Amino acid sequence: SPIFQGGSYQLNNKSIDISSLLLDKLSGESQTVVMKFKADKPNSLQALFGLSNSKAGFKNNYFSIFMRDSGEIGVEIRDAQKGINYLFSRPASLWGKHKGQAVENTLVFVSDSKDKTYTMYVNGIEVFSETVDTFLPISNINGIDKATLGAVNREGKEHYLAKGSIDEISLFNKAISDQEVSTIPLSNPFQLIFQSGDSTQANYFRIPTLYTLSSGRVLSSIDARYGGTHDSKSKINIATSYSDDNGKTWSEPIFAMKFNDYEEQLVYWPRDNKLKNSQISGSASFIDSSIVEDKKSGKTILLADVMPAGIGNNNANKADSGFKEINGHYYLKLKKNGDNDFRYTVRENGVVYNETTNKPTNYTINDKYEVLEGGKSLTVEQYSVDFDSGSLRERHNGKQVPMNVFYKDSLFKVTPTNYIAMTTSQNRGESWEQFKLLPPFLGEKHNGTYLCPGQGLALKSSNRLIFATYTSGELTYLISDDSGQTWKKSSASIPFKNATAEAQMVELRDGVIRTFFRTTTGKIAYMTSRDSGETWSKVSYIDGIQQTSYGTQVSAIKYSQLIDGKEAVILSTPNSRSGRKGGQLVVGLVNKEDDSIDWKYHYDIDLPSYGYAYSAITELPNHHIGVLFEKYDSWSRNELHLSNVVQYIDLEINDLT
């Protein structure tokens, strides 16, 4: 079926000409390129493949498949006479190295004249799909006379010289279907747990977690993000999946926490500069999850932040908890439609009580935070979103759903601020219970704290459960000794105002906790408790790892085995002062005399220039390490709204050292 096939070409800053093999075979208006290639030391911008008009006066007449040392992939399709200059790309589409060896990437470009569409897949993932009104076949460019590997020949000179290798290349005079694409063999160093088109119906995912349960099951949680990769305000649900075989295969995702005020739509969110900041603005959401397992009860516990309709971090009421204190007890406040003030509370058995007239109403709130009148369920109409009119529209879709107090159309509404909720599973992640709000920890006039995403900590020698959270000026550890039925706080002051101090904990020895956390200084910080978390030391910093000024979540575990005769801690973080890239696992050996850590080994996840943001790590039952991570720069305004960049890998200790 192919018109051309070649192999083992080495690109060392000198192009290979293949004109007399390929050019005379190109025909018709549809084509497909399949390319298996390695590039572990790429130049800044380099072409892998070129079709050009190399004659003087025609320098803007070519097709190329190009890559950047940031991991971006794209095509150019240019014809000066037709007036067409197409450029399509997506960042963070590529792999560089895995376990000291160059990764073979599989690229498939489809040029389809019947539908007027250009489609790119890398490593089995669709990275762009672009329909045009004036279609330009790649073979139909005016005066093409060269086919080149490792450059584009423009006016006689090699432009975009490449470093790398093309192990295999094939061309077809056909636009192959999405069915035929799925049958091309792949050499992937990674797998997917959550992905576009699964049961969540979210097209985006952020904020991975991983935790190894006592049965050997590995559980993962994540943000299922509907309106692009934007934080709240937006539509976001919390989804989960588990593996019963050391991470080799994963279950179909379910919801741990979800709202029904807006539809679950799989949407292609715009990436152009005019529309990319569009944000879903009338929906409730959840954001940032954390997991722990409780030994005594056998329950699995998951917390996440909760945002009412149209609320997120920058518009949330900072001077209000959402609760009223009436003699040491806390009651959720509510505002009725037509009132200027919060005149109601939710008392015992969900009774809506009028604070102004001190009388109970005919309304109640159920365990699901839904409103009943005289025992009868009230409803609201659902919204859906679209870009059909050229901008974002949010509108009623004709479907009735239970009236919830976090919803925009509810007769009774909560304070517009941030909350924390918990759910539990009694079957290790196969189903999740209805969520319950946690109470305020810092008083009536203080907004909720922010949960640190990743793992809670279960102390080895006791029944103590701890979840780190942050707020302005401190880490607020939430402690429960009774399977999450009651909670208390433990504050640890930090020398930063308004930092995103996302924290993760390890147990060095019984009752001894070291917490590693994100700061605003470009260094990872730490503090120790020898108290089982009652009291905390001052702050110190890690040398040998760099972050940016705004910083990035760091994951941390205590390994179960000795390395070079000593106990070991493993950290996962970007190691770069420029952006969220240069991902590492760093292995530290503990000194038994003073609890200091000697960071002795630094393992390269991929190339220094390739994206790496938030991450999850766990020791798998077989002593391997599982890593689930954002493989892109999640801060950059150039890398927003990418699908299937949250990816999973498996490593062994001997790879790291």
UniProtKB/Swiss-Prot annotation:
An MF annotation (GO) of this entry: exo-alpha-sialidase activity
Active site: 231 (proton acceptor), 502, 614 (nucleophile)
Pfam family, one: Sialidase
Keyword Repeat on entry: yes
EC number(s) given by UniProt: 3.2.1.18
UniProt enzyme class: hydrolase
UniProt BNR repeat ranges: 241-252, 423-434, 478-489, 527-538
Keywords: Glycosidase, Hydrolase, Repeat, Signal
Family: Belongs to the glycosyl hydrolase 33 family.
Name of the protein described by the UniProt record: Sialidase B
Organism of origin: Streptococcus pneumoniae serotype 4 (strain ATCC BAA-334 / TIGR4)
